[PDB]
């Protein structure tokens, strides 16, 4: 068996098993009850039908795998954005649990990112409806959304903590200059550093690199010397060591699908372009997962401009990078 093609799905991993859920395609959200598992050592798939509080089928959800427990936040279904939070213990028939979190949740959102640090899930950014005044951060409307939709939407720079000891939402008080509001950025965690690269804001797909110190809540902008990757959204950014982040794919401001790959060297603050055999397989809105065997496993996404919906080339291919 092989999963149907898709973009905007989630893929999370424990370093050996990759769990794939959700997304959409063209003849259409994929079936909500299906969980696809890819064994990274053997390269074979297995479909599991889940039960319990199965989430609606969505694209743009934000998921993590912590100690083989999957957590899912936010996303976009046929009736718009959500801020619901789910848990699926993958450690018998797997059962989704919708969690009743305490505290003030983030605004309903998709295309965001997350950092995992000890007992905390830390969510940043995204695209969705207007929040409430009490939320710390900034929100910027997408002007185009006032004619396309019944509810206008926009970008945020919000940082929210979900504390898994109590399933309670909070917001930290940060110092430094946060990145601008953005969506379709990519987040990656190494140690106590929550890195974020690129994303869409206003009329640009950006090339900037920041990290949030997850001990001190201080924001830092990184300015690597020399050649940097072109700005983009819908890319992946994946930790592959205690000193390296792996970047692949995405979409430029001028709407060019990308097949370039790079390593960011943290200790050197330097980007290194990565040579690979997939130069003719650009991907945007794919997922990337690191394996315990020195590989990055890219799945799904679209080979061309998926904003032209009737021509979109959604994929079900596995691309394997040896980093």
């Amino acid at each position: 068996a092989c999963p149907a093609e898709r973009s905007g799905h989630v893929a999370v991993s424990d370093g050996r098993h990759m769990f794939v859920w959700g997304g959409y395609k063209s003849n259409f959200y994929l079936p909500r009850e299906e969980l696809w598992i890819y064994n990274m050592e053997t390269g074979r798939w297995k479909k599991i039908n889940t039960e319990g509080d199965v989430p609606p089928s969505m694209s743009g959800s934000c998921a993590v795998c912590v100690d083989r427990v999957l957590y899912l936040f936010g996303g976009h279904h046929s009736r718009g954005n959500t801020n619901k939070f789910y848990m699926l213990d993958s450690r018998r028939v797997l059962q989704w649990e919708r969690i009743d979190c305490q505290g003030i949740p983030p605004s309903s959102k998709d295309k965001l990112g997350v950092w995992v640090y000890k007992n905390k899930l830390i969510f940043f950014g995204g695209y969705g409806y207007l929040p409430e005044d009490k939320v710390l951060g900034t929100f910027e409307f997408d002007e185009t959304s006032f004619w396309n939709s019944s509810h206008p939407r926009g970008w945020n720079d919000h940082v929210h903590i979900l504390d898994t000891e109590t399933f309670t939402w909070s917001q930290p008080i940060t110092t430094g200059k946060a990145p601008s509001p953005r969506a379709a950025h990519a987040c990656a965690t190494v140690g106590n550093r929550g890195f974020v690269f690129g994303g869409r804001y206003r009329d640009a797909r950006m090339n900037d690199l920041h990290y949030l110190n997850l001990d001190t809540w201080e924001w830092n902008e990184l300015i690597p010397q020399g050649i940097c990757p072109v700005g983009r959204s819908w890319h992946s950014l994946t930790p592959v060591s205690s000193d390296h982040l792996f970047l692949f794919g995405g979409f430029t401001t001028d709407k060019q699908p990308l097949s370039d790959a790079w390593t960011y060297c943290i200790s050197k603050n330097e980007w290194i372009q990565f040579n690979h055999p997939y130069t003719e397989k650009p991907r945007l809105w794919h997922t990337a997962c690191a394996s315990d065997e020195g590989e990055v496993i890219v799945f799904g996404g679209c080979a061309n401009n998926l904003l032209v919906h009737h021509r979109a080339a959604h994929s079900n291919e596995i691309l394997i990078f040896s980093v």
């Binding site: 905007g8 959409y24 694209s59 743009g60 976009h76 718009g80 998709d110 295309k111 695209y127 997408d142 185009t144 959304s145 396309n148 939709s149 939407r153 926009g154 970008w155 969506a183 379709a184 869409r200 959204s233 819908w234 979409f251 809105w285 998926l306 904003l307 919906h309």
Partner: peptide, 6 residues
């Protein structure tokens, strides 16, 4: 509607 904001 699901692709906006990127």
């Amino acid at each position: 509607n699901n692709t906006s904001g990127s």
